[PDB]
């Protein structure tokens, strides 16, 4: 029925690697001392442009096209902030103590104090980056985790449900195939699988706490939010 289940492990990895969105740049202004309104403007503008690439990255995820239009909308509405965060965390691996929102926008926890309530989200994001760096997370594992977020985070807020779970099982087979490829023993394979999937619980937590902060930003009306971001934000009520 669906061609995603017929792909092999390497073909699954290649399709996810080739689908990777590009690393966008922040607005050029050197700008570096920041205020609440200026930092929120740079991140909001960056997040709005990353969403356009994420939506096109989602259609390239094997099995995502097979869902109905409403099912695709629901999965992206619930996962979009998680996907932004895990990408930011992955970009910040090689920069301990820093968050790489863009190649020209590297911030630390001191700059998170400019925005009211963001320093808490910053520390959790930095902690996830240290966790990935301590685990030596590979890019093949990262694209698997990110697609798991897209398919799993909304599967329980809905025949069609068995499709997503079978695609989720495919990625699980792909993750194990990557770990057996790197020489990990059987005990190390299911242990590392568990460690990686448990971090998704914390990424969900960071997203929920992030949604609250972005909701108060709409009520503060300090920075005008784009209509696309407003629709993704109103989906969480």
């Amino acid at each position: 029925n669906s061609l995603a289940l017929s792909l092999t492990a390497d073909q699954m990895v290649s399709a996810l690697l080739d689908a990777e969105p590009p690393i966008l740049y922040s607005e050029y202004d050197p700008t570096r001392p920041f205020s609440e309104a200026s930092m929120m403007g740079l991140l909001t503008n960056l997040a709005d442009r990353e969403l356009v690439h994420m939506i096109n990255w989602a259609k390239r995820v094997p099995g995502f096209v097979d869902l109905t239009l409403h099912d695709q909308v629901h999965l992206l509405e619930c996962a979009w902030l998680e996907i932004l965060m895990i990408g930011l965390v992955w970009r910040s691996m090689e920069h301990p103590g820093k968050l790489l929102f863009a190649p020209n926008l590297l911030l630390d926890r001191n700059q998170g104090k400019c925005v009211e309530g963001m320093v808490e989200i910053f520390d959790m994001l930095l902690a996830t980056s240290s966790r990935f760096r301590m685990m030596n997370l590979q890019g093949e594992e990262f694209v698997c985790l990110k697609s798991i977020i897209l398919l799993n985070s909304g599967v329980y807020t809905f025949e069609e449900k068995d499709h997503i779970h079978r695609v989720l099982d495919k990625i699980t087979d792909t993750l194990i195939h990557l770990m057996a490829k790197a020489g990990l023993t059987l005990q190390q394979q299911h242990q590392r699988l568990a460690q990686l999937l448990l971090i998704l619980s914390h990424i969900r937590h960071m997203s929920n706490k992030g949604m609250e902060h972005l909701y108060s930003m709409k009520c503060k009306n300090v920075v005008p939010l784009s209509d696309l971001l407003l629709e993704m934000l109103d989906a969480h009520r």
Partner: peptide
């Protein structure tokens, strides 16, 4: 009418 609807159908 959702913007997300339009972006998922475009390319």
């Amino acid at each position: 009418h959702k913007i997300l609807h339009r972006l998922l159908q475009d390319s």
